[PDB]
Amino acid sequence: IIKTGDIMFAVLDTSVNSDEPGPILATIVTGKLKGSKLIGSFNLPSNADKMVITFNTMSIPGAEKTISISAYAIDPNTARTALASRTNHHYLMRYGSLFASSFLQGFGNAFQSANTTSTLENAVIGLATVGKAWSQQAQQLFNTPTTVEVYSGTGLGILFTQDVT
Amino acid sequence: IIKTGDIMFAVLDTSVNSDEPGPILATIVTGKLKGSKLIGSFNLPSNADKMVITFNTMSIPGAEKTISISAYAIDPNTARTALASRTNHHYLMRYGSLFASSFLQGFGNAFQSANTTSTLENAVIGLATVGKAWSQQAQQLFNTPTTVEVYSGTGLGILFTQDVT
Amino acid sequence: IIKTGDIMFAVLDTSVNSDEPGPILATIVTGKLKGSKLIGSFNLPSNADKMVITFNTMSIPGAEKTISISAYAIDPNTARTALASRTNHHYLMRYGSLFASSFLQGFGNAFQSANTTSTLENAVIGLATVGKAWSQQAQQLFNTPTTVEVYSGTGLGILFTQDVT
Amino acid sequence: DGCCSKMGGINYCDSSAGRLVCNNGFYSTCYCTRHAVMDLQFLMGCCLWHGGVYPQLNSSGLVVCNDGYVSEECSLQK
Amino acid sequence: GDTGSLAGLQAMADSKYTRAQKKQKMGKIREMALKETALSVGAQAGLAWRAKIIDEQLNKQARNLDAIYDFNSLVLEHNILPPVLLEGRNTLNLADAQSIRISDRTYKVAKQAHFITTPPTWRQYLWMDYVKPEAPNVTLLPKTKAEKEIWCIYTERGWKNGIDQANTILEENIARIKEDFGGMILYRKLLAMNMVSPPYVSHTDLGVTGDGSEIHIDDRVLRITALPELNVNSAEWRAAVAK
Numbered sequence: 001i002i003k004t005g006d007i008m009f010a011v012l013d014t015s016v017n018s019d020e021p022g023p024i025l026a027t028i029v030t031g032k033l034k035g036s037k038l039i040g041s042f043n044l045p046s047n048a049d050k051m052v053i054t055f056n057t058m059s060i061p062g063a064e065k066t067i068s069i070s071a072y073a074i075d076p077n078t079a080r081t082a083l084a085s086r087t088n089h090h091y092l093m094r095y096g097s098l099f100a101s102s103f104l105q106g107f108g109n110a111f112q113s114a115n116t117t118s119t120l121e122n123a124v125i126g127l128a129t130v131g132k133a134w135s136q137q138a139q140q141l142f143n144t145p146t147t148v149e150v151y152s153g154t155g156l157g158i159l160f161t162q163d164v165t
Numbered sequence: 166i167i168k169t170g171d172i173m174f175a176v177l178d179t180s181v182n183s184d185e186p187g188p189i190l191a192t193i194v195t196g197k198l199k200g201s202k203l204i205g206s207f208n209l210p211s212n213a214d215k216m217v218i219t220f221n222t223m224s225i226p227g228a229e230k231t232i233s234i235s236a237y238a239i240d241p242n243t244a245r246t247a248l249a250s251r252t253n254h255h256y257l258m259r260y261g262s263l264f265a266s267s268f269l270q271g272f273g274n275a276f277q278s279a280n281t282t283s284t285l286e287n288a289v290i291g292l293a294t295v296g297k298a299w300s301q302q303a304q305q306l307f308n309t310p311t312t313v314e315v316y317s318g319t320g321l322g323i324l325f326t327q328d329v330t
Numbered sequence: 331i332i333k334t335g336d337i338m339f340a341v342l343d344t345s346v347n348s349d350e351p352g353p354i355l356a357t358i359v360t361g362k363l364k365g366s367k368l369i370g371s372f373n374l375p376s377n378a379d380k381m382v383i384t385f386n387t388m389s390i391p392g393a394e395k396t397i398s399i400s401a402y403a404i405d406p407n408t409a410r411t412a413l414a415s416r417t418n419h420h421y422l423m424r425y426g427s428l429f430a431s432s433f434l435q436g437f438g439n440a441f442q443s444a445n446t447t448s449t450l451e452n453a454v455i456g457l458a459t460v461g462k463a464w465s466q467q468a469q470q471l472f473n474t475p476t477t478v479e480v481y482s483g484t485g486l487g488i489l490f491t492q493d494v495t
Numbered sequence: 496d497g498c499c500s501k502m503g504g505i506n507y508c509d510s511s512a513g514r515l516v517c518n519n520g521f522y523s524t525c526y527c528t529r530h531a532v533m534d535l536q537f538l539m540g541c542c543l544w545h546g547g548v549y550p551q552l553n554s555s556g557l558v559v560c561n562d563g564y565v566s567e568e569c570s571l572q573k
Numbered sequence: 574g575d576t577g578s579l580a581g582l583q584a585m586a587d588s589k590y591t592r593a594q595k596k597q598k599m600g601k602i603r604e605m606a607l608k609e610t611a612l613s614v615g616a617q618a619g620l621a622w623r624a625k626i627i628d629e630q631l632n633k634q635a636r637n638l639d640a641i642y643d644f645n646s647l648v649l650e651h652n653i654l655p656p657v658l659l660e661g662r663n664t665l666n667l668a669d670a671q672s673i674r675i676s677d678r679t680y681k682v683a684k685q686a687h688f689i690t691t692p693p694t695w696r697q698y699l700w701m702d703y704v705k706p707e708a709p710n711v712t713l714l715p716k717t718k719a720e721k722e723i724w725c726i727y728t729e730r731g732w733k734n735g736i737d738q739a740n741t742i743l744e745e746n747i748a749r750i751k752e753d754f755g756g757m758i759l760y761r762k763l764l765a766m767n768m769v770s771p772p773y774v775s776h777t778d779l780g781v782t783g784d785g786s787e788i789h790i791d792d793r794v795l796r797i798t799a800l801p802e803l804n805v806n807s808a809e810w811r812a813a814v815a816k
Binding site: 166168169170171210211212214215217237239243244245246247263264266267270271272274276278279282291296300303304307324325326328 | 343345346347349350352353355359367368369387389391394396403435438442446451452454455456458460462463464468477479482
């Protein structure tokens with residue numbers, strides 16, 4: 001018997017990325033249930049600003065039983081439900097690719113255009129035709145989102161959602 | 166028994182963003198119910214001037230019971246349903262990005278065009294073709310809405326909707 | 331028994347904007363029903379020169395009951411259905427944005443064209459190409475309606491519509 | 496921690512006495528086995544002089560010694 | 574204010590007290606969250622520390638405890654703990670109108686006499702537990718210096734309350750052991766003055782016994798058949814005078 005929506009603590013050990021989903025486990029280190037194990041997964045947010053973790057498979061040591069309380073988690077000493085990681089991984093790469101390809105396109109066309117008004121023509125050659133295909137490929141790949149990633153050694157706090165026997 | 170439409174008070178601990186819905190709990194500290202806790206979630210407004218919270222999952226100590234009074238909350242010291250946070254989140258980023266991309270487009274086209282009336286031509290090159298793709302990407306991401314964010318230690322008042330037994 | 335369409339008085343405390351529907355409660359302070367409360371919501375008029383509040387959920391002390399008399403309210407010392415707020419909310423912003431973007435469009439095109447009959451060309455660059463995207467987004471945002479928000483300390487008079495027991 | 500300090504050194508732990516023997520023939524004042532004559536006057540633990548701790552996972556915050564007694568200080572407070 | 578109440582209600586005409594209410598409503602809501610946590614941690618810490626202190630002081634004077642609570646001088650000859658007596662003087666009950674019951678002296682037997690193995694000491698009556706909790710299970714933390722100082726002083730209040738609770742627990746235990754010894758000495762006095770009936774023990778014995786595999790040489794069986802009770806004869810009782 002556990003009252004609805006109480007707060008306990010667990011320790012998260014299994015670090016996983018928010019791109020290829022899988023089971024994740026945590027373990028309670030205090031409270032009435034001590035050393036109890038908890039398996040679940042994550043969800044993907046709409047934007048990369050936070051991360052919440054779905055836990056539903058709870059087991060208590062001693063007996064051969066496996067209960068199914070589905071509950072969520074909160075960050076101790078921050079009291080927010082985001083993730084302590086980095087999110088700035090995949091802005092600068094695609095930005096640099098786009099700017100490089102575009103600058104190449106402009107270099108070829110304009111320095112060929114203002115020839116009225118050999119190696120410089122070779123620069124025109126190179127940037128002129130490597131610009132276009134690289135530009136459309138970068139425009140293809142630009143929409144890949146940034147991933148967040150949970151850590152392997154951060155403790156966590158758990159709220160309950162429903163009750164158990 | 167609880168009268169229709171009365172006022173109680175609680176403390177918010179779990180801070181939350183208005184981007185991904187999740188459970189938020191408060192705890193009543195005064196009134197008839199002492200030590201009771203309450204779980205709910207939020208919704209999203211059309212405009213960024215407020216934020217309201219749906220509170221439905223009330224749990225009381227004493228007996229193993231789970232009432233479902235669906236009520237909302239009122240912010241004390243203003244007596245409104247707004248948010249005490251920032252609303253100026255993503256105006257400047259998108260405005261500056263779009264304006265810079267357009268300025269780049271203009272620099273390339275006009276300073277290539279007015280040549281009748283080398284490094285300057287390279288400036289023409291760069292802004293000329295990095296303007297357009299960044300401009301259409303700014304047009305792509307220009308409509309991301311502005312968020313609001315509740316805090317982790319701000320108290321609250323609660324106004325009720327119907328009766329319980 | 332309450333007569334068809336009589337007059338009582340109450341006090342509005344829970345202030346709210348005319349944007350997100352929800353419960354708003356007032357409390358009767360006088361007459362036969364002293365200390366009774368009343369919950370309702372609002373509706374948006376097509377023109378923001380006034381504002382009306384539907385009041386439907388009446389709660390009386392004494393017995394565990396919930397009556398359902400639906401009625402509206404009127405302004406003390408005005409004897410009107412207008413609302414104390416401000417209605418000049420979003421004229422200047424949209425007018426200035428549209429006229430600025432259009433002015434920029436004009437500046438770029440006319441001073442580009444008038445080169446027949448450096449930094450001036452840069453002025454052409456800037457206003458010319460930042461004009462258009464800002465202009466179409468301003469035309470997108472121009473139809474935002476003006477809002478109103480009620481006050482947290484305004485008393486009110488209530489006329490009724492039908493009878494109760 | 497030198498048990499044969501200013502003496503020879505450790506020879507062996509006589510487990511019949513629970514204590515070591517120094518090179519000069521004297522029992523040092525260090526012990527080496529758990530089974531030895533100690534002098535305990537202060538103790539830890541709770542539910543003493545009773546049935547120990549009843550191992551039931553209690554929903555309530557109070558604990559019960561297995562002879563039926565309940566200890567407030569071993570329990571919590573409200 | 575409400576002290577010069579007409580003056581305070583006059584001074585509430587302006588909006589200054591109204592806007593002063595708002596700047597303290599935030600405190601009047603935020604104050605009752607951290608204070609309970611502070612009181613709880615102060616109560617637990619004070620209870621633990623005062624418990625350990627008084628157990629130390631109780632162990633300090635262990636000899637005279639035995640010297641005053643010798644039960645081994647008080648057992649009877651068949652290893653039998655004497656029973657427990659209780660008494661009252663000049664009792665009265667009023668049930669309702671026109672009904673009064675008075676009684677001069679009263680005696681009630683609480684714990685029946687029985688066999689025992691060892692004389693019980695004081696340590697199963699007066700010794701209390703001590704487990705130090707070294708984990709502060711604390712969620713809320715102060716932000717400003719005002720929060721810090723109310724946290725400090727409420728923790729002090731909890732420390733005092735834990736000390737008080739430990740003292741009350743010790744008082745109850747002292748009362749319990751004192752009345753048990755008093756009931757013992759009361760039984761001894763009444764048996765001396767021939768007001769009660771002493772217990773009676775029968776013992777039988779057999780010879781050698783058992784099968785071809787098990788044998789017992791001297792087998793003796795002792796049973797108690799007559800409990801201590803109260804005689805009610807008028808002329809039976811004996812008095813005592815002093816010099």
